[PDB]
Design a protein around this ligand. Structure first.
Ligand SMILES: CCCCCCCC(=O)OC[C@H](COP(=O)(O)O[C@@H]1[C@H](O)[C@H](O)[C@@H](OP(=O)(O)O)[C@H](OP(=O)(O)O)[C@H]1O)OC(=O)CCCCCCC
Ligand SMILES: CCCCCCCC(=O)OC[C@H](COP(=O)(O)O[C@@H]1[C@H](O)[C@H](O)[C@@H](OP(=O)(O)O)[C@H](OP(=O)(O)O)[C@H]1O)OC(=O)CCCCCCC
Lengths: 52, 52
């Protein structure tokens, strides 16, 4: 069961790597580039929301 | 029943054609023009969301 869990983790991280590949296309590359920074800022905002 | 399904599809596509007619009015023409591009970009964003 632990190996199965680790395999699920491997699957999700492999999907993350797949997401990296899409950056080449002009259509959805800038979208991901923006998404990263938005994710950072949203993480900080959610941290503050979490605290109160 | 298959003919009924096809008739429902015909109805929805006819409503799409009706939506095309509204473009003439200045009030809600630019709205539809914007909606098309927003739909394209949102479709790409939803594709990425779908994958992860
Ligand atoms: C389902 C999971 C994901 C599916 C795959 C989804 C992968 C995916 O979404 O990529 C789309 C990509 C779009 O290509 P893309 O339109 O960005 O290509 C550029 C674009 O056309 C620009 O408009 C061009 O500049 P401009 O107009 O002249 O100014 C530029 O030419 P240049 O200026 O540089 O000379 C072009 O290079 O198409 C592929 O070929 C990738 C091969 C993927 C192979 C797919 C195999 C299935
Ligand atoms: C319920 C399903 C949908 C219902 C129907 C809903 C259809 C619908 O929503 O259209 C609204 C439309 C609005 O007309 P609209 O206000 O855009 O007309 C233009 C507008 O008044 C601009 O302000 C004018 O420019 P400006 O001010 O001078 O700068 C321009 O004059 P010009 O500058 O070009 O000379 C005008 O042409 O009214 C109709 O006549 C369409 C006939 C529809 C007939 C309706 C029959 C029922």
């Amino acid at each position: 069961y632990s190996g199965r869990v680790i395999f699920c983790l491997d699957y999700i991280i492999f999907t993350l790597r797949l997401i990296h590949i899409f950056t080449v296309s002009r259509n959805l590359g800038p979208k991901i580039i923006m998404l990263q920074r938005m994710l950072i800022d949203v993480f900080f905002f959610l941290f503050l929301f979490a605290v109160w």
